[PDB]
Amino acid sequence: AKEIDVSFVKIEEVIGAFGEVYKGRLKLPGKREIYVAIKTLKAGSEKQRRDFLSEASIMGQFDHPNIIRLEGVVTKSRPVMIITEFMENGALDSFLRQNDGQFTVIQLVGMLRGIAAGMKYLAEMNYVHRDLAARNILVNSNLVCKVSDFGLSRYLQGKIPVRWTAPEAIAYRKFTSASDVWSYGIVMWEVMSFGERPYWDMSNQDVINAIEQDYRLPPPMDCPAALHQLMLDCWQKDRNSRPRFAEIVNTLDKMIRNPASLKTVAT
């Protein structure tokens, strides 16, 4: 949480919308200027400010190729800002909708590997993310995916979603790595369907009720059976039966190096 002087921050275009996200530039003194992402908080409470900046605090604890990098913060003026690395291709879900059918299965598995490795590391550092979703994964020009948006994260040492959340985490507020793994399975589905909304237009209560009756998302079109099986493994009712992130990583790497294991289609 490195406190950045506002003179060093130049705010360019708005790239998104309790505040906005901007493309920007940064002239740290002695550094070559770089492009940045600037998340601001609408300037009108102390409590809202603290919980906005806490994301930065948690984000600044990590150093990993698949975790979003923090350049620094602005907290002594308004609006308060969290300044992160600039990710050319935006959010993963809208980026895949923009490139529908135009990445290979191997490329897609590579994106899922990166997300998985980022989560392995977050689980190892003792954090539960609690909001892992394709919209919270950002992608750079080389197609590296980085886990982002640590605002609901918990160090274990508006209208809130439900369709990325484990059944036990919905029903009893019991969030763990194991629940993150459930979310990772939904991200998998989101990737292999090139940015479809989970459960389509099923209501929040329809999702909750369907899950309870052992319904699970059907395989996206042209999805490999092994990938669909990993999704199912991620969505086991009993959380102790779900693979850990280490295992997920290893499974994917096994696919990567055995590409013929990805030719058999589920659906």
Short mmCIF file of C-alpha atoms in Angstrom, two decimals:
data_model
loop_
_atom_site.label_atom_id
_atom_site.label_comp_id
_atom_site.label_asym_id
_atom_site.label_seq_id
_atom_site.Cartn_x
_atom_site.Cartn_y
_atom_site.Cartn_z
CA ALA A 1 0.00 0.00 0.00
CA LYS A 2 2.59 2.49 -1.27
CA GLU A 3 1.28 6.03 -0.91
CA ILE A 4 1.48 7.71 -4.32
CA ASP A 5 1.64 11.50 -4.82
CA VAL A 6 -1.27 12.71 -7.02
CA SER A 7 1.16 14.72 -9.21
CA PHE A 8 2.43 11.34 -10.49
CA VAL A 9 -1.04 10.22 -11.55
CA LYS A 10 -2.49 11.33 -14.89
CA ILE A 11 -6.09 10.11 -15.44
CA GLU A 12 -6.94 9.45 -19.12
CA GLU A 13 -10.11 7.71 -20.38
CA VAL A 14 -12.77 5.91 -18.38
CA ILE A 15 -12.62 2.17 -19.02
CA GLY A 16 -15.44 1.22 -16.61
CA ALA A 17 -17.88 1.99 -13.75
CA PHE A 18 -19.05 2.77 -6.18
CA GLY A 19 -16.82 4.89 -8.42
CA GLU A 20 -15.05 4.35 -11.75
CA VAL A 21 -12.01 2.66 -13.27
CA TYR A 22 -9.68 4.68 -15.52
CA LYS A 23 -6.75 4.03 -17.85
CA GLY A 24 -3.93 6.26 -16.68
CA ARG A 25 -0.22 6.98 -16.70
CA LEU A 26 2.28 7.04 -13.80
CA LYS A 27 5.57 9.01 -13.55
CA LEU A 28 7.21 7.71 -10.43
CA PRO A 29 10.25 9.89 -9.87
CA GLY A 30 13.26 8.12 -11.43
CA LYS A 31 11.00 5.53 -13.11
CA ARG A 32 10.04 5.28 -16.78
CA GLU A 33 6.39 6.20 -17.09
CA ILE A 34 3.87 3.32 -17.27
CA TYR A 35 0.21 2.77 -18.09
CA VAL A 36 -1.98 2.03 -15.07
CA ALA A 37 -5.52 1.14 -13.99
CA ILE A 38 -7.10 3.60 -11.52
CA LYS A 39 -10.02 2.47 -9.33
CA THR A 40 -11.55 5.44 -7.46
CA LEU A 41 -14.18 5.69 -4.74
CA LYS A 42 -16.94 8.31 -5.12
CA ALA A 43 -15.76 11.07 -2.70
CA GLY A 44 -18.93 11.23 -0.51
CA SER A 45 -18.03 7.67 4.66
CA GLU A 46 -14.87 6.88 6.64
CA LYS A 47 -16.08 3.26 6.93
CA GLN A 48 -16.77 2.96 3.19
CA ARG A 49 -13.28 4.44 2.61
CA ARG A 50 -11.54 1.93 4.92
CA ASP A 51 -13.24 -1.09 3.27
CA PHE A 52 -12.44 0.29 -0.19
CA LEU A 53 -8.72 0.68 0.64
CA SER A 54 -8.49 -2.67 2.48
CA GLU A 55 -8.64 -4.33 -0.95
CA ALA A 56 -5.32 -2.55 -1.65
CA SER A 57 -3.83 -3.78 1.66
CA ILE A 58 -4.62 -7.41 0.79
CA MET A 59 -3.63 -7.01 -2.84
CA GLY A 60 -0.28 -5.49 -1.75
CA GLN A 61 0.54 -8.64 0.20
CA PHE A 62 0.90 -10.72 -2.97
CA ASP A 63 3.63 -11.17 -5.58
CA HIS A 64 2.63 -13.70 -8.25
CA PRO A 65 2.38 -13.73 -12.05
CA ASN A 66 -1.33 -14.50 -11.94
CA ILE A 67 -2.26 -12.01 -9.22
CA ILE A 68 -3.03 -8.42 -10.08
CA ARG A 69 -0.10 -6.11 -9.21
CA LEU A 70 -0.54 -3.03 -6.98
CA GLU A 71 1.55 0.02 -7.90
CA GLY A 72 0.20 1.98 -4.97
CA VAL A 73 -2.59 4.00 -3.39
CA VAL A 74 -3.83 7.60 -2.97
CA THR A 75 -5.48 8.07 0.43
CA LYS A 76 -4.58 11.58 1.61
CA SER A 77 -6.72 13.32 -1.04
CA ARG A 78 -10.15 12.74 -2.67
CA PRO A 79 -11.20 10.66 -4.44
CA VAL A 80 -9.13 7.86 -2.89
CA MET A 81 -7.57 5.63 -5.52
CA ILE A 82 -6.14 2.15 -5.92
CA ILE A 83 -3.64 2.05 -8.77
CA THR A 84 -2.89 -1.30 -10.38
CA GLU A 85 -1.15 -2.66 -13.47
CA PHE A 86 -2.96 -1.97 -16.75
CA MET A 87 -4.50 -5.06 -18.34
CA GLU A 88 -4.90 -4.48 -22.08
CA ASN A 89 -7.66 -7.03 -22.72
CA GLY A 90 -9.93 -6.13 -19.77
CA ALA A 91 -12.11 -8.59 -17.90
CA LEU A 92 -11.93 -12.25 -19.00
CA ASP A 93 -15.65 -12.79 -19.60
CA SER A 94 -16.35 -9.87 -21.97
CA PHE A 95 -12.96 -10.56 -23.63
CA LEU A 96 -14.00 -14.12 -24.48
CA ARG A 97 -17.45 -12.88 -25.71
CA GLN A 98 -15.47 -10.52 -27.99
CA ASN A 99 -13.46 -13.53 -29.31
CA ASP A 100 -16.19 -16.15 -29.47
CA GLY A 101 -14.82 -19.47 -30.78
CA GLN A 102 -11.50 -17.87 -31.73
CA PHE A 103 -9.16 -19.33 -29.07
CA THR A 104 -8.09 -22.98 -29.20
CA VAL A 105 -8.84 -25.45 -26.43
CA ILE A 106 -5.14 -25.40 -25.42
CA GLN A 107 -5.12 -21.60 -25.21
CA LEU A 108 -8.23 -21.75 -22.99
CA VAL A 109 -6.70 -24.39 -20.72
CA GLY A 110 -3.64 -22.08 -20.46
CA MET A 111 -5.89 -19.28 -19.19
CA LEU A 112 -7.49 -21.68 -16.70
CA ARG A 113 -4.03 -22.78 -15.60
CA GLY A 114 -3.05 -19.21 -14.79
CA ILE A 115 -6.23 -18.53 -12.82
CA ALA A 116 -5.63 -21.88 -10.99
CA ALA A 117 -2.02 -21.06 -10.16
CA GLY A 118 -3.09 -17.64 -8.82
CA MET A 119 -5.64 -19.28 -6.57
CA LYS A 120 -3.20 -22.00 -5.40
CA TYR A 121 -0.96 -19.17 -4.22
CA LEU A 122 -3.88 -17.28 -2.57
CA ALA A 123 -4.93 -20.50 -0.77
CA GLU A 124 -1.29 -21.07 0.29
CA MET A 125 -1.07 -17.50 1.72
CA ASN A 126 -4.25 -18.26 3.70
CA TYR A 127 -6.74 -16.05 1.88
CA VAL A 128 -10.26 -16.94 0.84
CA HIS A 129 -11.23 -14.83 -2.23
CA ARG A 130 -15.05 -15.27 -1.89
CA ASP A 131 -15.79 -13.57 -5.20
CA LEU A 132 -13.92 -15.56 -7.82
CA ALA A 133 -15.78 -15.01 -11.13
CA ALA A 134 -14.67 -14.47 -14.74
CA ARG A 135 -15.58 -10.78 -14.36
CA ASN A 136 -12.93 -10.60 -11.61
CA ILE A 137 -10.18 -12.08 -13.80
CA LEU A 138 -8.17 -9.63 -15.96
CA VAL A 139 -6.22 -10.43 -19.12
CA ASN A 140 -3.14 -8.77 -20.66
CA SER A 141 -1.88 -8.56 -24.26
CA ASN A 142 -0.03 -11.91 -24.01
CA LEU A 143 -3.27 -13.58 -22.75
CA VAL A 144 -1.99 -14.01 -19.19
CA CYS A 145 -4.92 -14.11 -16.79
CA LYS A 146 -4.55 -12.50 -13.36
CA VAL A 147 -6.90 -12.87 -10.36
CA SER A 148 -8.21 -9.48 -9.23
CA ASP A 149 -10.79 -7.77 -7.01
CA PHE A 150 -9.82 -8.68 -3.45
CA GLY A 151 -12.55 -6.54 -1.78
CA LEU A 152 -14.54 -9.42 -0.29
CA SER A 153 -11.32 -11.35 0.47
CA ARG A 154 -10.66 -12.62 3.99
CA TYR A 155 -7.26 -13.28 5.46
CA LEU A 156 -7.83 -16.47 7.56
CA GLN A 157 -4.98 -15.58 9.85
CA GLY A 158 -24.67 -3.81 -3.95
CA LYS A 159 -26.88 -6.79 -4.91
CA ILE A 160 -24.45 -9.59 -3.91
CA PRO A 161 -24.26 -12.52 -6.38
CA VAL A 162 -25.09 -16.16 -5.67
CA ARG A 163 -24.39 -18.19 -8.85
CA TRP A 164 -20.63 -18.34 -8.25
CA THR A 165 -20.95 -19.33 -4.62
CA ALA A 166 -20.76 -22.81 -3.03
CA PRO A 167 -24.04 -24.13 -1.58
CA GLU A 168 -22.55 -24.33 1.94
CA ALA A 169 -21.27 -20.72 1.64
CA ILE A 170 -24.71 -19.47 0.58
CA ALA A 171 -26.65 -21.46 3.26
CA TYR A 172 -24.32 -21.16 6.30
CA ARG A 173 -21.89 -18.31 5.35
CA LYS A 174 -19.05 -20.92 5.53
CA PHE A 175 -16.45 -19.58 3.05
CA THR A 176 -13.23 -21.58 2.58
CA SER A 177 -10.68 -22.40 -0.10
CA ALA A 178 -13.01 -25.36 -0.82
CA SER A 179 -15.78 -22.85 -1.64
CA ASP A 180 -13.32 -20.94 -3.85
CA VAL A 181 -12.72 -24.17 -5.69
CA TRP A 182 -16.52 -24.32 -6.38
CA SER A 183 -16.20 -20.81 -7.86
CA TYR A 184 -13.17 -21.93 -9.86
CA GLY A 185 -15.36 -24.63 -11.47
CA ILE A 186 -17.90 -21.98 -12.49
CA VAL A 187 -15.02 -19.86 -13.97
CA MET A 188 -13.99 -22.98 -15.91
CA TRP A 189 -17.51 -23.19 -17.36
CA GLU A 190 -17.44 -19.46 -18.09
CA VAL A 191 -14.21 -19.87 -20.03
CA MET A 192 -15.15 -22.94 -22.08
CA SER A 193 -18.45 -21.28 -23.06
CA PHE A 194 -16.64 -18.10 -24.12
CA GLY A 195 -18.31 -15.78 -21.55
CA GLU A 196 -21.79 -17.16 -21.05
CA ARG A 197 -23.62 -16.21 -17.84
CA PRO A 198 -23.71 -19.15 -15.38
CA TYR A 199 -27.18 -20.78 -15.31
CA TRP A 200 -28.27 -18.26 -18.01
CA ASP A 201 -31.48 -16.52 -16.94
CA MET A 202 -32.29 -18.92 -14.05
CA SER A 203 -33.16 -16.84 -10.95
CA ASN A 204 -31.00 -16.84 -7.79
CA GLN A 205 -33.57 -19.04 -6.04
CA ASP A 206 -33.78 -21.40 -9.08
CA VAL A 207 -29.98 -21.85 -8.92
CA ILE A 208 -30.01 -22.51 -5.14
CA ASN A 209 -32.88 -25.00 -5.48
CA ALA A 210 -31.35 -26.75 -8.52
CA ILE A 211 -27.98 -27.14 -6.86
CA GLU A 212 -29.72 -28.67 -3.84
CA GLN A 213 -31.34 -31.28 -6.08
CA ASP A 214 -27.89 -32.21 -7.45
CA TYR A 215 -28.25 -30.33 -10.76
CA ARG A 216 -24.95 -29.21 -12.28
CA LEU A 217 -24.26 -27.03 -15.34
CA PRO A 218 -24.19 -29.04 -18.55
CA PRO A 219 -21.00 -29.01 -20.61
CA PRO A 220 -20.44 -26.05 -22.90
CA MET A 221 -20.46 -26.77 -26.66
CA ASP A 222 -17.30 -28.57 -27.82
CA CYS A 223 -16.14 -28.90 -24.19
CA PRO A 224 -13.62 -31.73 -23.57
CA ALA A 225 -14.94 -34.49 -21.25
CA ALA A 226 -11.86 -34.22 -18.97
CA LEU A 227 -12.47 -30.48 -18.49
CA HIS A 228 -16.17 -31.08 -17.77
CA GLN A 229 -15.17 -33.78 -15.27
CA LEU A 230 -12.85 -31.36 -13.46
CA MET A 231 -15.78 -28.88 -13.24
CA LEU A 232 -17.93 -31.64 -11.73
CA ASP A 233 -15.11 -32.51 -9.30
CA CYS A 234 -15.02 -28.82 -8.35
CA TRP A 235 -18.82 -28.86 -7.75
CA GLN A 236 -19.05 -31.80 -5.32
CA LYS A 237 -21.65 -31.28 -2.57
CA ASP A 238 -19.26 -32.41 0.11
CA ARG A 239 -16.47 -29.84 0.12
CA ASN A 240 -13.85 -32.28 1.38
CA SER A 241 -14.25 -34.23 -1.87
CA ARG A 242 -13.37 -31.21 -4.05
CA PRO A 243 -9.83 -31.06 -5.34
CA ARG A 244 -7.47 -28.50 -3.80
CA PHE A 245 -5.91 -25.82 -6.05
CA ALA A 246 -2.57 -27.66 -6.11
CA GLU A 247 -4.37 -30.71 -7.56
CA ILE A 248 -6.24 -28.60 -10.08
CA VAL A 249 -3.00 -27.01 -11.29
CA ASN A 250 -1.43 -30.50 -11.67
CA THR A 251 -4.48 -31.86 -13.53
CA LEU A 252 -4.35 -29.03 -16.04
CA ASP A 253 -0.62 -29.37 -16.59
CA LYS A 254 -1.30 -33.07 -17.27
CA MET A 255 -3.85 -32.02 -19.93
CA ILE A 256 -1.40 -29.42 -21.37
CA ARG A 257 1.27 -32.04 -21.85
CA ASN A 258 -1.22 -34.71 -22.99
CA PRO A 259 -3.32 -32.71 -25.52
CA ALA A 260 -4.87 -35.86 -27.04
CA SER A 261 -6.73 -36.27 -23.71
CA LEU A 262 -8.77 -33.16 -24.73
CA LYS A 263 -10.17 -34.45 -28.07
CA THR A 264 -12.99 -36.55 -26.55
CA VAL A 265 -15.95 -34.22 -26.16
CA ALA A 266 -18.43 -34.26 -23.27
CA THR A 267 -20.94 -32.24 -25.26
#
